[PDB]
Structure formats: structure tokens, C-alpha cells
Design a protein around this ligand. Structure first.
Ligand SMILES: *[C@@H]1O[C@H](CO)[C@@H](O[C@@H]2O[C@H](CO)[C@@H](O[C@@H]3O[C@H](CO)[C@@H](O)[C@H](O)[C@@H]3O)[C@H](O)[C@H]2NC(C)=O)[C@H](O)[C@H]1NC(C)=O
Ligand SMILES: *[C@@H]1O[C@H](CO)[C@@H](O)[C@H](O)[C@H]1NC(C)=O
Lengths: 49, 35
């Protein structure tokens, strides 16, 4: 759901949608993520190690 | 490269501006080409 459940009913949405919206929260549309989803989503995997 | 994309058609907002123009000119063709 993401940020939606702090107001009430939580809505089912895939994760790749969620942080793709947080890109819209800094000033760049989804073009940054999906055009680089393989690498971009892989870095967070290594950052946690 | 994008993941999750699905094939979908994109409509043209300019398309309705041209569909209403072809019908009018089709009638005149038969009135002058044959003779
Ligand atoms: C436009 O839509 C067409 C669908 O009519 C897309 O082409 C087809 O996409 C499917 C996606 O699953 C391909 O199916 C896969 O084919 C492989 C190879 O045979 C098979 O091993 C898989 O199990 C799966 O069935 C299909 O092959 C493909 N057809 C062709 C002719 O490429 C197309 O990608 C869409 N294009 C755009 C720009 O959205
Ligand atoms: C077709 O040509 C004839 C020739 O005299 C004319 O009278 C008629 O008005 C034309 N048709 C149209 C729709 O203008």
C-alpha cells in the first residue's frame, strides 16, 4: 500500500509502483526508475548488505 | 527495457480533426472523373 494506510484502508499496489512515486517526490518522473529498474533496484539489494 | 509494460494502442487527438474531412470530398470525385 505504501503511504496510504496512515489515513485508513490500505490499497493493494505492487512495490515497483510505490518508490516510483517517490521519484515523483523529488522532481523526476518514472523515467528514471523503469528505464533502469534492473540496476536501480539491484543497488538497494547491495546497500543493505 | 522497461518491466511490466503491456501492449496498448495510443489514440491521436489530431485524428478526430481529419475523419470529418474525407467524406465531403469523396462525392465530388465521381462527378468529374467519369466524364
Ligand atoms: C504488442 O503485443 C504483442 C502481442 O500480440 C507482443 O508480442 C508478443 O509478446 C508476447 C509476450 O509474452 C510473446 O510471448 C512469448 O513468446 C516467446 C517466444 O515464442 C515464448 O517462448 C513465451 O512463452 C511467450 O509466449 C510473443 O512472442 C510476442 N509476439 C511477437 C510476434 O513478438 C509485443 O511485444 C507487443 N509490442 C509492444 C511494443 O507492446
Ligand atoms: C454534380 O455535377 C452536376 C453537373 O451539372 C451539378 O449540377 C451537381 O450540382 C453536382 N453535384 C453536386 C453535389 O454539386
Amino acid at each position: 500500500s505504501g503511504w496510504t494506510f496512515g489515513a485508513g484502508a490500505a490499497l493493494q499496489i505492487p512495490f515497483a509502483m510505490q518508490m516510483a512515486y517517490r521519484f515523483n517526490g523529488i522532481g523526476v518522473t518514472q523515467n528514471v526508475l523503469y528505464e533502469n529498474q534492473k540496476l536501480i533496484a539491484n543497488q538497494f539489494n547491495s546497500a543493505i548488505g | 527495457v522497461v518491466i511490466g509494460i503491456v501492449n496498448n494502442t495510443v489514440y491521436d487527438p489530431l485524428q478526430p480533426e481529419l475523419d470529418s474531412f474525407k467524406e465531403e470530398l469523396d462525392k465530388y470525385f465521381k462527378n468529374h472523373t467519369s466524364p
